[PDB]
Amino acid sequence: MAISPRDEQNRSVDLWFAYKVPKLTKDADSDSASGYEYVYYDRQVGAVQKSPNLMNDPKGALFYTLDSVFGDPGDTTGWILYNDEMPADANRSNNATLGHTKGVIAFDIASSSALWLLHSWPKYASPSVPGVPTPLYGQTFLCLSLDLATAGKLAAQMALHQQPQVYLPRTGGLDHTSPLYALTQPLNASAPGDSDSLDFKTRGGVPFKVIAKNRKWGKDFWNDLVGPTLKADMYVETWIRGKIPPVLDSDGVHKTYDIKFIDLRKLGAPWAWPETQDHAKWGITTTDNWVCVGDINRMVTQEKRGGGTIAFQDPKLWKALCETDLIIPPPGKTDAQARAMIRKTHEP
Amino acid sequence: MAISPRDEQNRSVDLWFAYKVPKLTKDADSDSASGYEYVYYDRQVGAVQKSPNLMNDPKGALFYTLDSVFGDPGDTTGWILYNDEMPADANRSNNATLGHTKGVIAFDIASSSALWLLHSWPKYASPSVVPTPLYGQTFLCLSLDLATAGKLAAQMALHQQPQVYLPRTGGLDHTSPLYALTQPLNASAPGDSDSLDFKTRGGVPFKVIAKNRKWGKDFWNDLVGPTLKADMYVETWIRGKIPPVLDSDGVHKTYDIKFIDLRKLGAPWAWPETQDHAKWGITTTDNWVCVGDINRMVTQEKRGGGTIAFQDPKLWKALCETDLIIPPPGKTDAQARAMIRKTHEP
């Protein structure tokens, strides 16, 4: 009854991760993937595996987690929802200056418990309308078990840097002095620095960092902030960070050759797809097993808006994500030539 | 020194059209096309053919036309520039409630002459100062008299509501509709669309068919087609996103399916329609060619914009024959065409 992430069988769990696949076409009558299939990971199952559920079913870690919050809240249960693209039932108009951060912070004062769900779905989530979010993209999800003090400290950072667009909150009787309450009130883009990083732990003791940029930041979020904060290089060499132009097949006909693919087949999830059909808001380091899941994608071109990423160390998840790389060269080209075309997208 | 479109040899011409190719690559070290190559058409040459020039050269119809305006203007020469994405030297934030329209109206009051250049480049043009080469684009440039340019300006003030920047009035009287286009656009438009008939100085009839920000229907099938009393040729248009499709190696990939192919016009390139601004269309009969501000996507913002429509059997046939359909692996031409039509769904 304390607020907690829920796993695939509705059991309380300290942390979970999911990678949802995009909608993928088999033929005119059927999809290979609807876009709600996913792989699931937590440290109890100990492996990244294909889920038997669809994410929009009323089953699986996402539903069980959010239903445990919204379904029958206590007198001191509350929540903060935010999204730069709010769902249709939101209680405010859009503010285009706020951060491109999306998520849910839920809490219960009496039990001193909280959770944080990070996702990248536009128009999600709603506390009373099961909205149908888009199936078209690969996406990642991270859900963490928190104590109330950690949720408050996180909300204080977000009020300063990420500056999320908060909608339909429930305060559960919070003191107006609480940073959780302050996050529901108007924000001031005032901080003099351009970034911030904080250390936290889950209730289970798993260390993580929240690494944020604000509207002043104009450099490379990944190589100039995240990497240096982790004291490790981001593994970027096969990232798509811009557009590859159409590539010649033959006789002057140029086609999309994606070159870089994300491949989950080693995890029992029988799908591989272009990185351009992926939100690509995760990254790993080349050493020390850091996994980052967050608000900011891999494109060199970015807006001057707040946002951040969660970083934590996980050898098992790091290995699984490392092994999702798939490089397919265009016709007549080598692997080295394909890698050079990918790296060219890193040029501004 | 009367204002006029200039052709590929820097001679005055009543009308010209250009189709610029996107940047196209062979590998990381070589490109098949820089994205400044183009085919050119006017009624004097009477053929749609690849230009010897690049559009960023200090020659060719685009350079010669704009240089005849910006290069050494007389005291009565002026211009209205507009773009929903203003260039950097405007030093102003964009107003997203104004129209998609991009272009240049230039004029000289002493000679009662004007020209209209329609283009689709963001952040362009600037009277003193590199536009993206990444997309296929169309251009149209028309010779107008000052009265016609003012009638067009009056329509724009109501419907397209273009975002004007760095104007030069050339001493325009403030009661001119051209001058009003440089002032804040506050007039309320009646209805959600408008269509007007015009002619070039050379007598070529054209229509300007415009929607305003209250329009929420299909610009092409519900406004343009009915205005022209013809059907738009849309059956192979990409009007939405096609998901990745399964290949035999077990991986899902981008298959473009619909390509734009200029090889029969001497330009040895074909490319995905998704790498094309696709702001042109033709009808199935009566030889209508439309070049404008509005692309083919079903999803549209509620903002102003329009298209220029005129009849030209020669350009119509050239554009019609640029279709190229390539099915995904294992699929037939019929299945490919059904996948394209699927992008037309609401």
PDB file of C-alpha atoms in Angstrom, chain A residues 56 63 89 123-133:
ATOM      1  CA  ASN A  56      -1.692  -0.570 -23.302  1.00  0.00           C
ATOM      2  CA  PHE A  63      -0.460  -0.450 -16.067  1.00  0.00           C
ATOM      3  CA  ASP A  89      -7.934  16.366 -20.584  1.00  0.00           C
ATOM      4  CA  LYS A 123      -0.131  13.172 -24.451  1.00  0.00           C
ATOM      5  CA  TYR A 124       0.478  10.806 -21.526  1.00  0.00           C
ATOM      6  CA  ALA A 125      -0.411  10.079 -18.783  1.00  0.00           C
ATOM      7  CA  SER A 126      -3.858  11.004 -17.510  1.00  0.00           C
ATOM      8  CA  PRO A 127      -5.141  10.156 -14.002  1.00  0.00           C
ATOM      9  CA  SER A 128      -8.646   9.317 -15.246  1.00  0.00           C
ATOM     10  CA  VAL A 129      -8.582   8.990 -19.055  1.00  0.00           C
ATOM     11  CA  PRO A 130      -6.684   5.950 -20.351  1.00  0.00           C
ATOM     12  CA  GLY A 131      -5.413   7.837 -23.367  1.00  0.00           C
ATOM     13  CA  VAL A 132      -4.104   5.815 -26.293  1.00  0.00           C
ATOM     14  CA  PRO A 133      -0.538   7.044 -26.895  1.00  0.00           C
TER      15      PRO A 133
END
